[PDB]
């Protein structure tokens, strides 16, 4: 069982480089509390819970700050309340991936007015990633993923029957999120390699 109500409840319950790192470290503690509120996540083996969050944390944070930023003009609102605009993104060397977040995620979430239940379900789908390496029983994760997207489709079809393509439109933002998560992670590993990141943090562990 996988009720969209509980997925929405999980959502509602929770120098540029330094600003980005501080903001990611903060949201990693929050992301663990979100994951435990997703139905049946905490019933997986503990080592599989570790594997899923290591595989998806950066996509899960990117989805959230993208949805948070739909009302910001040409910028990204970080969870600390600080903004990232184009000037500072270029000074961090991440101008091109910044543009891709705006054009592939924020603007498209805005266009279709993606709501918070839909965001929560896409994030639960990312969380339940059955391709994560080393899972004790990948198919158990695929099973939960399938329950999430069954619930998402029924939700969209009830709330937005005039938009029959809406469910697929949501799922087809996931390749963009995967591209963009990979590139953000590359920059983060670089910041750490050259010694520009805060030390002794949860973020350092994830990297």
């Amino acid at each position: 069982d996988m009720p969209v109500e509980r997925i929405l409840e999980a959502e509602l319950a929770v120098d540029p480089v330094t600003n980005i790192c501080q903001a990611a470290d903060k949201q990693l503690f929050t992301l663990v509390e979100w994951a435990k509120r997703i139905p049946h996540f905490s019933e997986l083996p503990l080592d599989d819970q570790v594997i899923l969050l290591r595989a998806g944390w950066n996509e899960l944070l990117i989805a959230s700050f993208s949805h948070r930023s739909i009302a910001v003009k040409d910028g990204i609102l970080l969870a600390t309340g600080l903004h990232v605009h184009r000037n500072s993104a270029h000074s961090a060397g991440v101008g091109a991936i910044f543009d891709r977040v705006l054009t592939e995620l924020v603007s498209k979430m805005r266009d279709m007015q993606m709501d918070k239940t839909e965001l929560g379900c896409l994030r639960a789908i990312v969380l339940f990633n059955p391709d994560s390496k080393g899972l004790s029983n990948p198919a158990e994760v695929e099973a939960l993923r399938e329950k999430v997207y069954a619930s998402l489709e029924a939700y969209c079809k009830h709330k937005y029957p005039e938009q029959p393509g809406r469910f697929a439109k949501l799922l087809l933002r996931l390749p963009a999120l995967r591209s963009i998560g990979l590139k953000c992670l590359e920059h983060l590993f670089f910041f750490k390699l050259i010694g520009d990141t805060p030390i002794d943090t949860f973020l350092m562990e994830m990297l």
């Binding site: 503690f29 663990v32 994951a35 435990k36 905490s42 503990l46 819970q49 570790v50 969050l53 290591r54 949860f202 562990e205 994830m206």
Partner: peptide
């Protein structure tokens, strides 16, 4: 993964 493994476990003050 000491931090994540701890955070996932229930019963923390």
């Amino acid at each position: 993964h000491k931090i994540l493994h701890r955070l996932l476990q229930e019963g923390s003050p």
